[PDB]
Enzyme design. Structure first.
Site, PDB file in Angstrom:
ATOM      1  N   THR A   1       0.829  -1.203   0.000  1.00 57.24           N
ATOM      2  CA  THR A   1       0.000   0.000   0.000  1.00 57.24           C
ATOM      3  C   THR A   1       0.867   1.258   0.000  1.00 57.24           C
ATOM      4  O   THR A   1       1.795   1.375   0.802  1.00 57.24           O
ATOM      5  CB  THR A   1      -0.931  -0.029   1.214  1.00 57.24           C
TER       6      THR A   1
ATOM      7  N   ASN B   1      -2.468  -9.798   8.251  1.00 56.62           N
ATOM      8  CA  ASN B   1      -2.173  -8.455   8.735  1.00 56.62           C
ATOM      9  C   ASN B   1      -3.296  -7.762   9.503  1.00 56.62           C
ATOM     10  O   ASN B   1      -3.289  -6.535   9.640  1.00 56.62           O
ATOM     11  CB  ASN B   1      -1.660  -7.574   7.591  1.00 56.62           C
TER      12      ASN B   1
ATOM     13  N   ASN C   1      -2.378  -4.623  13.802  1.00 62.01           N
ATOM     14  CA  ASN C   1      -3.834  -4.463  13.830  1.00 62.01           C
ATOM     15  C   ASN C   1      -4.525  -5.306  14.904  1.00 62.01           C
ATOM     16  O   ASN C   1      -5.685  -5.689  14.764  1.00 62.01           O
ATOM     17  CB  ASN C   1      -4.437  -4.656  12.435  1.00 62.01           C
TER      18      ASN C   1
ATOM     19  N   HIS D   1      -6.346 -11.386   0.465  1.00 60.70           N
ATOM     20  CA  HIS D   1      -5.680 -10.971   1.692  1.00 60.70           C
ATOM     21  C   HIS D   1      -6.422 -11.514   2.912  1.00 60.70           C
ATOM     22  O   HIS D   1      -7.558 -11.128   3.181  1.00 60.70           O
ATOM     23  CB  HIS D   1      -5.635  -9.458   1.773  1.00 60.70           C
TER      24      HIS D   1
ATOM     25  N   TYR E   1      -6.570  -7.484   8.920  1.00 57.50           N
ATOM     26  CA  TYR E   1      -7.714  -6.903   8.235  1.00 57.50           C
ATOM     27  C   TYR E   1      -8.924  -7.845   8.360  1.00 57.50           C
ATOM     28  O   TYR E   1      -8.900  -8.764   9.178  1.00 57.50           O
ATOM     29  CB  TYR E   1      -7.322  -6.466   6.815  1.00 57.50           C
TER      30      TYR E   1
END
Ligand SMILES: Cc1cc2nc3c(=O)[nH]c(=O)nc-3n(C[C@H](O)[C@H](O)[C@H](O)COP(=O)(O)O)c2cc1C
Ligand SMILES: COC(=O)/C=C(\C#N)c1ccc(F)cc1
Ligand SMILES: [Mg+2]
Ligand code: NA
Length: 397
Positions: free
Chosen positions: A37, A194, A251, A191, A196
């Site tokens: 990103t 991480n 996260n 994904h 999310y």
């Protein structure tokens, strides 16, 4: 300038420089660009950057036969919440993505779109502004106090997804994958890492549900596997990979502190191998290493030494991409690539070295990265890192 103290090693004599087939793609070497990103997409509409994105990807596609996984791309407005990350749901977005994919292919490299859904990592105020929910697996545990507060201030409290809302996300994953392939991408990466949304379902800290989507290993994996199956049906197993970070804490995921964490990920790997043996093998599994439990800590920090991803190899028998602090550690890469189905993702140093592959082959110095411009609305720190030739001309030696 170049990284000081770094002692480069030429890796041209290792399997890093042996060709390998991933999905439909004949890679010429095993140095992969993992998803990164960069926040250059423009608002409104989450549009890939009209000025610089093609150049960015063109630079990093320069070594023929390189596999590139794109920055995360939102599958829908509800999946988003960052104004400057791109989507793959709209015609406007796909116009720019098509240019990007074409440029990568002109350089004889390959491109896989990472499909992203933020869940609790999104900004609740952006979502509220756009009339959208602030989503996660549960509604009684939060990423941090700041996010919980932000959500409350915005009258957009963290919301535990209903089954119907999960199905809607799956619909959006399917359409995003279709959009990606139609625009010219070689495949997609789901994904599920991480911290999310999909990771928020996998992890027992973030998933306190008592329905079929939580409360057990099989239940926590349900959403991820439903997305895998939906995409395999839509565009084929050869065009689908999955990303996982078993030991990640970014996260507010559990990492190794959760004694059940290896079992949770072993179950997912097992289910993938089951599908593979039944004739639908994913193109790859992509793992973030315990070498980097949080990618916003300097290399060497946040290393978890109490776990290994090696367990995955006992279960999943297909290609594995491993990422995490490998650029500064050719001695580790030299050992890992002895395994003949292992590829290496290089993240932060692909940001700063467009010709990283040449530098790895030949044992050249690496450009230092500038973390300040990792996320920035600028060409600076995006498309103005020099190749090794350019760096020499600038006197960096
Ligand atoms: C600026 C930045 C952006 C990233 N964006 C993504 C992303 O969009 N999707 C993803 O799965 N990982 C993302 N990552 C994690 C990286 O893919 C990678 O796993 C991590 O940086 C560790 O590898 P490295 O030590 O080679 O950088 C990002 C990392 C950084 C530093
Ligand atoms: C659209 O996808 C994203 O915005 C992805 C990230 C952000 N921000 C991201 C995903 C994984 C990481 F390890 C770091 C950033
Ligand atoms: Mg490659
Ligand atoms: Na930030």
């Amino acid at each position: 300038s170049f990284v000081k103290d770094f002692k480069p090693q030429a890796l041209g004599d290792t399997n890093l420089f042996k060709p390998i087939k991933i999905g439909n793609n004949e890679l010429l070497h095993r140095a992969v660009i993992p998803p990164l990103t960069r926040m250059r997409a423009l608002h409104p509409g989450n549009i890939p950057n009209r000025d610089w994105a093609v150049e960015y990807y063109t630079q990093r596609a320069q070594r023929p036969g390189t596999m590139i996984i794109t920055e995360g791309a939102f599958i829908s407005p509800q999946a988003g919440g960052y104004d400057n990350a791109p989507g793959v749901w709209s015609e406007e977005q796909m116009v720019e993505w098509t240019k990007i994919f074409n440029a990568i292919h002109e350089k004889k490299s390959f491109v896989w779109v990472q499909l992203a859904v933020l869940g609790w990592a999104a900004f609740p105020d952006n979502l509220a502004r756009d009339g959208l929910r602030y989503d996660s697996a549960s509604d009684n545990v939060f990423m941090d106090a700041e996010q919980e507060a932000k959500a409350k201030k915005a009258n957009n409290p963290q919301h535990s997804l209903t089954k119907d809302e999960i199905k809607q996300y799956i619909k959006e994953y399917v359409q995003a994958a279709k959009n990606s392939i139609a625009a010219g991408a070689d495949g997609v990466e789901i994904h599920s890492a991480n911290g999310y949304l999909l990771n928020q379902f996998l992890d027992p800290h973030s998933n306190t549900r008592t329905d079929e989507y939580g409360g057990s290993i099989e239940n926590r994996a349900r959403f991820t596997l439903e997305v895998v199956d939906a995409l395999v049906e839509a565009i084929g197993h050869e065009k689908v990979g999955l990303r996982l970070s078993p030991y990640g804490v970014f996260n507010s995921m559990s990492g190794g502190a959760e004694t059940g964490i290896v079992a949770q990920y072993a179950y997912v790997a097992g289910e993938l191998e089951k599908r593979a043996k039944a004739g639908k093998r994913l193109a790859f599994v992509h793992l973030v290493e315990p070498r980097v439990t949080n990618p916003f800590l300097t290399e060497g920090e946040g290393e978890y030494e109490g776990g290994s991803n090696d367990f995955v190899y006992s279960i999943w028998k297909g290609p594995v991409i491993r990422a995490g602090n490998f650029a500064l550690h050719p001695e580790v890469v030299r050992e890992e690539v002895k395994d003949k189905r292992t590829l290496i993702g290089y993240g932060r140093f692909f940001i700063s070295n467009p010709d990283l592959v040449d530098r790895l082959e030949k044992g050249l110095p690496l450009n230092k990265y500038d973390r300040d411009t990792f996320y920035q609305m600028s060409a600076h720190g995006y498309i103005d890192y020099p190749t090794y030739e350019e760096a020499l001309k600038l006197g960096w030696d």
